[PDB]
Amino acid sequence: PVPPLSVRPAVVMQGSARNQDDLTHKLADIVKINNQLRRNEQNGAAAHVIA
Amino acid sequence: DAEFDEGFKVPGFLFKKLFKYQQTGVRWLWELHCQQAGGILGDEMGLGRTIQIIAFLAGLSYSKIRRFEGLGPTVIVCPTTVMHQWVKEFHTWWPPFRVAILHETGSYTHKKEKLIRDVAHCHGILITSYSYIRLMQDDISRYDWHYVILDEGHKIRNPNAAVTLACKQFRTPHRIILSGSPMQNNLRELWSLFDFIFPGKLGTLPVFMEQFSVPITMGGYSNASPVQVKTAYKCACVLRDTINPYLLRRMKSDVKMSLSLPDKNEQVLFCRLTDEQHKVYQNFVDSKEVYRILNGEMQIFSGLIALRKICNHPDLFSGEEDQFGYWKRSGKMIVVESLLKIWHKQGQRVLLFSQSRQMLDILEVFLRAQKYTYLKMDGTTTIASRQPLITRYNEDTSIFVFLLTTRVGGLGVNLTGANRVVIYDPDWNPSTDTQARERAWRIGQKKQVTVYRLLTAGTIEEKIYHRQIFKQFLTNRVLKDPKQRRFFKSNDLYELFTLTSPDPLASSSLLAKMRARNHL
DNA sequence: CTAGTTGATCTCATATCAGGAGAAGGAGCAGAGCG
DNA sequence: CGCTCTGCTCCTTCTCCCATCCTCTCGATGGCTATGAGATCAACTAG
């Protein structure tokens, strides 16, 4: 379960740079590796790579 | 008539029109039909590969082989350019079949599903495109097709594309791929093609990679240990043996004496980057963006696009008589000017290809700037105007040069009218430029043709050239012969951002064969 | 009606040290039935 | 007479917890993840 935006608000700094929450960065890592694992299982990858 | 094993009689007049190799093909296709297996017609393009399907299906219908009384409803999936070409071909080489086109152009002018039903009931030959296959996997895969020919079937080379899955939803065993190059980048493409034609032969995709792609690839690298070279050699031979029955690949050397093609040439020209071109390239390689890409902070593709553009023309930045797309601003355009000058003086028809589409526009405005009468043909040119454009260019010699994007420019069009071919822009895919250059040197090309590959020395394009060479060697190692020489020129790393301009078997035959393979 | 044009809009292809306390598990082992 | 099934010890992980509230300053970090060709389709635009 990925929480809503209220639990991880993207606070705007003095300028326009929108800083993301720690939860959002972590979910970014999770989605990155999840997509990476999904393609590695779908396409050519070694068993140790998937592991 | 000509007669084969069980009941296959193909009409004699039709047979006599064929060549010897095309006759072999027809026999091969029928043997597959007997096995109920599929195959890849990997004949090199121009070798009249399509005619073989016509002959075989004609013979099958005529023989009335016994669910189906001869030839049932069948679907042809071919690239959008060539649909009417196939219709024309069926119509001439065998009028009796009904060949319905499934397209916006089409000829039906009602709902399409009615047409699908009509063909599936009256047993026609439904031509369609890969898109309409992707978009009506539901409708189309409800009608017990008898044959599922895919022309230029390499488009199914991605096992996960939607079109691939849609094509692999068809149920009949009589699946055929007509693909001049059934392997273009790596064997994953091969597995995909075999999994359409013959779903189990090469195993699952993971297992295929594990067992074949990894070893065969590792044997190509320059630094590979000899042990690994020999594992690659073994695996490559196993693969050829596995795929031998189901791939009929006649190159244009085992038929040349029996077919009499003209001379072919493959010159390469290492173009030199002009001053402004050099400056923009030298700056952008030194730019922070390239440095960040080297650090892996974002996608590499952006950098590669930028570099290719720079080498292709300074269209990163535009600089009277210095308007956008000015020839003198970029060296390759200077070379093209000289070549088209000499060739126009030779009264010769040229065929200029470009991987890009907007660059095809800059080439177009150039050819306006010159007095060269051209005809341009890319993805934006209407499909209905496509085959008539090809026919027009082939019928008269008034049209001198023929701008082409390689993606529609390749893929089954016949362009025998042109004589000289120049590949202006490299690709990461060797097959693209190969089919491009092969548009001319086909059956019916009654005049000599030479191929010029224009390349920028020391820039990205040379490294892309190295990529497509390494790919070509990998394809050769598994299609033409596994004794390929190792690609020693480069280590093929991410240092391609630099500018370095010039200046019964009786169980002893078996065991002997086994010992041979396992000695490697 | 019919080509032609034009947005969207999708798909596909390209690359490599001054904590402490308590609770839970495991290991070693004495010993007691007991078959 | 060896096998089991306790159940005691001892160690060893292993986890958790560490007053309230309030003021100020100061330093760091605060990113996109791209491109283009071809095909469909539906909107117009002209004929």
UniProtKB/Swiss-Prot annotation, chain A:
It is found in: Nucleus; Cytoplasm; Chromosome. The tandem heptapeptide repeats in the C-terminal domain (CTD) can be highly phosphorylated. The phosphorylation activates Pol II. Phosphorylation occurs mainly at residues 'Ser-2' and 'Ser-5' of the heptapeptide repeat and is mediated, at least, by CDK7 and CDK9. POLR2A associated with DNA is specifically phosphorylated at 'Ser-5' of the CTD by CDK7, promoting transcription initiation by triggering dissociation from DNA. Phosphorylated at 'Ser-2', Ser-5' and 'Ser-7' of the CTD by CDK9 (P-TEFb complex), promoting transcription elongation. Among tandem heptapeptide repeats of the C-terminal domain (CTD) some do not match the Y-S-P-T-S-P-S consensus, the seventh serine residue 'Ser-7' being replaced by a lysine. 'Lys-7' in these non-consensus heptapeptide repeats can be alternatively acetylated, methylated and dimethylated. EP300 is one of the enzyme able to acetylate 'Lys-7'. Acetylation at 'Lys-7' of non-consensus heptapeptide repeats is associated with 'Ser-2' phosphorylation and active transcription. Regulates initiation or early elongation steps of transcription specially for inducible genes. It comes from the Eukaryota. The C-terminal domain (CTD) serves as a platform for assembly of factors that regulate transcription initiation, elongation, termination and mRNA processing. The trigger loop allows entry of NTPs into the active site, switching between an open and closed state with each NTP addition cycle. Belongs to the RNA polymerase beta' chain family. Component of the RNA polymerase II (Pol II) core complex consisting of 12 subunits: a ten-subunit catalytic core composed of POLR2A/RPB1, POLR2B/RPB2, POLR2C/RPB3, POLR2I/RPB9, POLR2J/RPB11, POLR2E/RPABC1, POLR2F/RPABC2, POLR2H/RPABC3, POLR2K/RPABC4 and POLR2L/RPABC5 and a mobile stalk composed of two subunits POLR2D/RPB4 and POLR2G/RPB7, protruding from the core and functioning primarily in transcription initiation. Part of Pol II(G) complex, in which Pol II core associates with an additional subunit POLR2M; unlike conventional Pol II, Pol II(G) functions as a transcriptional repressor. This is DNA-directed RNA polymerase II subunit RPB1. It comes from Cricetulus griseus (Chinese hamster). The gene is POLR2A.
From Swiss-Prot, chain B:
Phosphorylation at these two sites promotes the intramolecular interaction of the N-terminal domain with the helicase ATP-binding domain, thereby probably releasing the inhibitory effect of the N-terminal domain on its ATPase activity. Phosphorylation is essential for its chromatin remodeling activity. Ubiquitinated at the C-terminus. Ubiquitination by the CSA complex leads to ERCC6 proteasomal degradation in a UV-dependent manner. Stabilized following interaction with KIAA1530/UVSSA, which promotes recruitment of deubiquitinating enzyme USP7, leading to deubiquitination of ERCC6 thereby preventing UV-induced degradation of ERCC6 by the proteasome. Residues 30-200 form the Helicase ATP-binding domain. ATP binds at D43, E44, M45, G46, L47, G48, R49, T50. A motif (CSA-interacting motif (CIM)) lies at residues 507-519. Essential factor involved in transcription-coupled nucleotide excision repair (TC-NER), a process during which RNA polymerase II-blocking lesions are rapidly removed from the transcribed strand of active genes. Plays a central role in the initiation of the TC-NER process: specifically recognizes and binds RNA polymerase II stalled at a lesion, and mediates recruitment of ERCC8/CSA, initiating DNA damage excision by TFIIH recruitment. Homodimer. Binds DNA. Interacts with ERCC8. Interacts with RNA polymerase II; interaction is enhanced by UV irradiation. Component of the B-WICH complex, at least composed of SMARCA5/SNF2H, BAZ1B/WSTF, SF3B1, DEK, MYO1C, ERCC6, MYBBP1A and DDX21. Interacts with KIAA1530/UVSSA. Interacts with ELOA and CUL5; the interaction is induced by DNA damaging agents or by inhibitors of RNA polymerase II elongation. Interacts (via WHD region) with RIF1. Interacts with SMARCC2/BAF170, SMARCB1/BAF47 and the neuron-specific chromatin remodeling complex (nBAF complex). This is DNA excision repair protein ERCC-6. The chain holds residues 490 to 1399 of 1493 of the full protein.
